[PDB]
C-alpha cells in the first residue's frame, strides 16, 4: 500500500509565494505511485488549512491558496499517521521542527539545532572555524557588547578588516556595503535596531559557488554549480572550475554538513577568487527547492531526478525518526 | 484580576517523576491570590491532559497523574483569556516544546529555541563559550560515522591534544548516561563504544581535579547572578572561595547567559582548581527547579524566596512575549 505524506507550505513570511511555488513544484513531481499526499496551507495570518489526496497536476499557484493544528498533522486521509511531513516554509529558525518533534511526526530536512544553528551566522561561522574551513576575515559580536564597548569592536575592525566591508545581521534584508567607518557605524546602528547579533565580513571579489549535499549519517555531495549576475558577462551547472577545486569544494561541503550536524540536506555556498582561493560563506539548511532551484538542479546534474530526490528526502526523514526512537528506548532502558 | 498561568509537566522522558515532583513544588509555591492556575499533564505515552482551576495544595505526585487537542489546550485559559505565562517543567531540555509555543504564539517561561537547543548540544555550547573567550578544558568532538572510518586517527588525536584521564560524553544528552572517565586508550575505546549506544556525536574532554561550582542567573535584558555555590549531594552555598574568584564566576556566568542568547534563566556550572583556575563546564537552560534544587537555593541565599523566584520568572516571560508582539510587524 501507499505511504502517507503531508506537504506544509505558506507561512507568515515575505517568502509566502515562493513557498507556494515550491509546493506546486514538489506536488507536481512527488512519485504518486508511492505516496498518498495531503497538503496543509498556512495563511499569511497563520490559519492552518488542509486538503486531502492531491492527485491531479497543479496548473496554478492560485489553486494552492486554500479557501486545530494538532488535529491536522496527527492523521492522514487514509486514516493512518503520516510516514513523513515535508515542510516548505520564520519557519527557518527550527520552531516548526520542534512542533513536529512534540507531535512525534517524522519530518523532512534539518532538525531543531541544525536549523537554528544555520540561521545564526555567528554560531555557524564559529563552527566553520572549529572545522578549520577557510573564511574571509570577519568579526561577530552582540549588540549588548557594541552598546557598551564600541571602541573595542571598532578597534578589531581597524586591526582585522579592510574597506569595503559587509555588515550582516546574524539572524535576519539589512545587509550593507560600507566603504569607511562612518558608513560602518551607520550600518551597525541600523542592523542593531532589529537584530541583537552581527557579523562584519571583509569584502571580496569572487565567484559564488554552491554545492548540494544529501543524507543523514553518510552524506554525499554534488559537483559545484555557480550563481552569476549574467551568464553572458542565473545558474550555471556544473561550474567552470578546475577538477581539484571542485573536489576540494565537495569535501568542504561534506565537512560543513558534519560540523553543523545537518540532517537530510544542506547547500554550502563558497566564495572562489580568480586565483582559486576558496572561502566558505555559509550553509543553508533550507535551500530553495523549486523545480529550477540550485539545490535540485545540482542533483539533476548527478543523475538524481527531482522525483527521486523528493523520494530520497522522504526515506531519510523516516530513517531519522526511527533512529531517534531507538536511542530513546536505549536511554529509557539504561 | 489575577494573571493566568499554565504549568506543563510529565513527558516521554525517564525524568517523568522528577517533572511531576517539580510541578508539585511549583504549584504549592505559587501565589494563588495573584495567579489563576491550570495544568497540563503529558503522559509517558504522550497524551496531553488538562485540569483547570488549581486552588488547593497538591498532596501527592499520584494526584498529578491526570486521567482534547494540543493547540486548544495551550491557546485558551480557563479564565477565557490567553495565558500570561506557560511554565514548561518537562523533550523539554532541547528546544522542541519551545518551538511549539512559538508557533502557537504562547508566552512561556525560560529560554527560547536557540538557547535551549544549543545548551543540549555540548559541541555548539562549547563554540559559543570559545567565541566569547571563556576558559574551557581541551576537548575534541566527532560523529559515529567518523569514528568508524578514522578510529586510529581519533585515538591519536585524543592522546596528542588531551591529557589522560579524559571524560567521554554524548554531545546531545542531559543526564549522566554514557559518560565515563577513561584513564587510557583501552578504557577510552570502551567508553566511546558505550557512549555510542545513546548518541551519534561525542565530545571527549581532558579531565581535571576540581571543585564543581555553579552560578544562577535570572532576567532577560539585565540578568543578575547569585553568589556561587559548590556541589560536593550536599549543596554548599555560598561556595568557600576567595572574594575575587566569586566575582569572576558571577561575571563569566552573566557573559555565558548573554552569549548563549538566554531568556529568563540559566545555571552556569564551572570547574575551579585548588589554585583557582576556572573552566566553564556547561550552561543548563532548564536547571532542576524543586524547592531543594541548586538553582532556587542559590537565589534563597540572595534573599529571593522560591515563591518570588517563580513570580519573577513569570514576569520575565510576560515581558519577553510582550516584546515579541510589539515587534511582530
Ligand atoms: N564578503 C563579501 N564580499 C562581496 N560581496 C558580498 C560579501 N558578502 C555578501 N556579498 C553580496 O551580498 C549578497 C547577499 O548576501 P549573502 O551573505 O550571500 O546572503 P545569502 O543568504 O547567501 N543570499 P540572499 O539571502 O539571497 O541575499 C551576496 O550574494 C553577494 O552578492
Ligand atoms: N572534564 C572533567 N573533569 C573532571 N570531572 C568531570 C569532567 N567532566 C565531567 N566530570 C564529572 O562528571 C559529571 C558529569 O559531567 P557533565 O558535563 O556535568 O554532564 P551532565 O550530563 O550535566 N551530568 P550532571 O553534571 O550530574 O547534571 C560532572 O559533574 C563531574 O562530576
Ligand atoms: Cl530584565
PDB file of C-alpha atoms in Angstrom, chain A residues 93-105 107 110-116 320 324, chain B residues 8 11-13 42 48 70 74 88 90-104 106 108 111-120 172 285-286:
ATOM      1  CA  UNK A  93      14.596  29.090  12.947  1.00  0.00           C
ATOM      2  CA  UNK A  94      13.765  25.500  13.999  1.00  0.00           C
ATOM      3  CA  UNK A  95      10.365  26.196  15.547  1.00  0.00           C
ATOM      4  CA  UNK A  96       8.109  24.219  13.206  1.00  0.00           C
ATOM      5  CA  UNK A  97      10.557  21.288  13.666  1.00  0.00           C
ATOM      6  CA  UNK A  98      10.032  21.422  17.435  1.00  0.00           C
ATOM      7  CA  UNK A  99       6.297  21.229  16.809  1.00  0.00           C
ATOM      8  CA  UNK A 100       6.813  18.129  14.664  1.00  0.00           C
ATOM      9  CA  UNK A 101       9.080  16.710  17.361  1.00  0.00           C
ATOM     10  CA  UNK A 102       6.456  17.155  20.114  1.00  0.00           C
ATOM     11  CA  UNK A 103       3.679  15.691  17.934  1.00  0.00           C
ATOM     12  CA  UNK A 104       6.016  12.833  17.058  1.00  0.00           C
ATOM     13  CA  UNK A 105       5.634  13.371  13.310  1.00  0.00           C
ATOM     14  CA  UNK A 107       9.787  15.241   9.017  1.00  0.00           C
ATOM     15  CA  UNK A 110      17.046  19.594   9.278  1.00  0.00           C
ATOM     16  CA  UNK A 111      16.159  19.244  12.955  1.00  0.00           C
ATOM     17  CA  UNK A 112      15.862  21.914  15.627  1.00  0.00           C
ATOM     18  CA  UNK A 113      19.519  22.551  16.479  1.00  0.00           C
ATOM     19  CA  UNK A 114      20.929  22.368  12.927  1.00  0.00           C
ATOM     20  CA  UNK A 115      18.040  24.517  11.656  1.00  0.00           C
ATOM     21  CA  UNK A 116      18.689  27.106  14.372  1.00  0.00           C
ATOM     22  CA  UNK A 320      15.998   9.753  11.214  1.00  0.00           C
ATOM     23  CA  UNK A 324      15.579   8.764  17.359  1.00  0.00           C
TER      24      UNK A 324
ATOM     25  CA  UNK B   8       3.110  21.842  31.772  1.00  0.00           C
ATOM     26  CA  UNK B  11       6.812  13.955  29.373  1.00  0.00           C
ATOM     27  CA  UNK B  12       8.017  10.844  27.494  1.00  0.00           C
ATOM     28  CA  UNK B  13      11.381  11.195  29.322  1.00  0.00           C
ATOM     29  CA  UNK B  42       1.714  14.917  29.231  1.00  0.00           C
ATOM     30  CA  UNK B  48      -1.994  15.622  26.792  1.00  0.00           C
ATOM     31  CA  UNK B  70      -2.972  20.237  21.999  1.00  0.00           C
ATOM     32  CA  UNK B  74      -2.484  25.818  25.200  1.00  0.00           C
ATOM     33  CA  UNK B  88       7.338  24.083  30.883  1.00  0.00           C
ATOM     34  CA  UNK B  90       9.217  18.789  31.439  1.00  0.00           C
ATOM     35  CA  UNK B  91      11.631  16.597  25.051  1.00  0.00           C
ATOM     36  CA  UNK B  92      11.969  19.663  27.343  1.00  0.00           C
ATOM     37  CA  UNK B  93      15.722  20.234  27.770  1.00  0.00           C
ATOM     38  CA  UNK B  94      16.213  20.674  23.978  1.00  0.00           C
ATOM     39  CA  UNK B  95      14.017  23.408  22.473  1.00  0.00           C
ATOM     40  CA  UNK B  96      11.175  21.343  20.960  1.00  0.00           C
ATOM     41  CA  UNK B  97       8.301  22.394  23.260  1.00  0.00           C
ATOM     42  CA  UNK B  98       9.680  25.944  22.908  1.00  0.00           C
ATOM     43  CA  UNK B  99       9.170  25.679  19.130  1.00  0.00           C
ATOM     44  CA  UNK B 100       5.620  24.539  19.685  1.00  0.00           C
ATOM     45  CA  UNK B 101       4.955  27.574  21.863  1.00  0.00           C
ATOM     46  CA  UNK B 102       6.485  29.964  19.349  1.00  0.00           C
ATOM     47  CA  UNK B 103       4.292  28.585  16.550  1.00  0.00           C
ATOM     48  CA  UNK B 104       1.126  28.749  18.700  1.00  0.00           C
ATOM     49  CA  UNK B 106       2.058  31.130  23.617  1.00  0.00           C
ATOM     50  CA  UNK B 108       6.468  30.871  28.112  1.00  0.00           C
ATOM     51  CA  UNK B 111      14.808  30.067  27.267  1.00  0.00           C
ATOM     52  CA  UNK B 112      13.871  30.185  23.593  1.00  0.00           C
ATOM     53  CA  UNK B 113      14.638  27.565  20.900  1.00  0.00           C
ATOM     54  CA  UNK B 114      18.257  28.609  20.280  1.00  0.00           C
ATOM     55  CA  UNK B 115      19.323  28.933  23.874  1.00  0.00           C
ATOM     56  CA  UNK B 116      17.557  25.706  24.933  1.00  0.00           C
ATOM     57  CA  UNK B 117      18.846  23.695  21.920  1.00  0.00           C
ATOM     58  CA  UNK B 118      22.489  24.834  21.871  1.00  0.00           C
ATOM     59  CA  UNK B 119      22.732  24.100  25.612  1.00  0.00           C
ATOM     60  CA  UNK B 120      21.687  20.482  24.968  1.00  0.00           C
ATOM     61  CA  UNK B 172      23.219  15.636  22.990  1.00  0.00           C
ATOM     62  CA  UNK B 285      18.813  26.112  30.160  1.00  0.00           C
ATOM     63  CA  UNK B 286      16.359  24.282  32.414  1.00  0.00           C
TER      64      UNK B 286
END
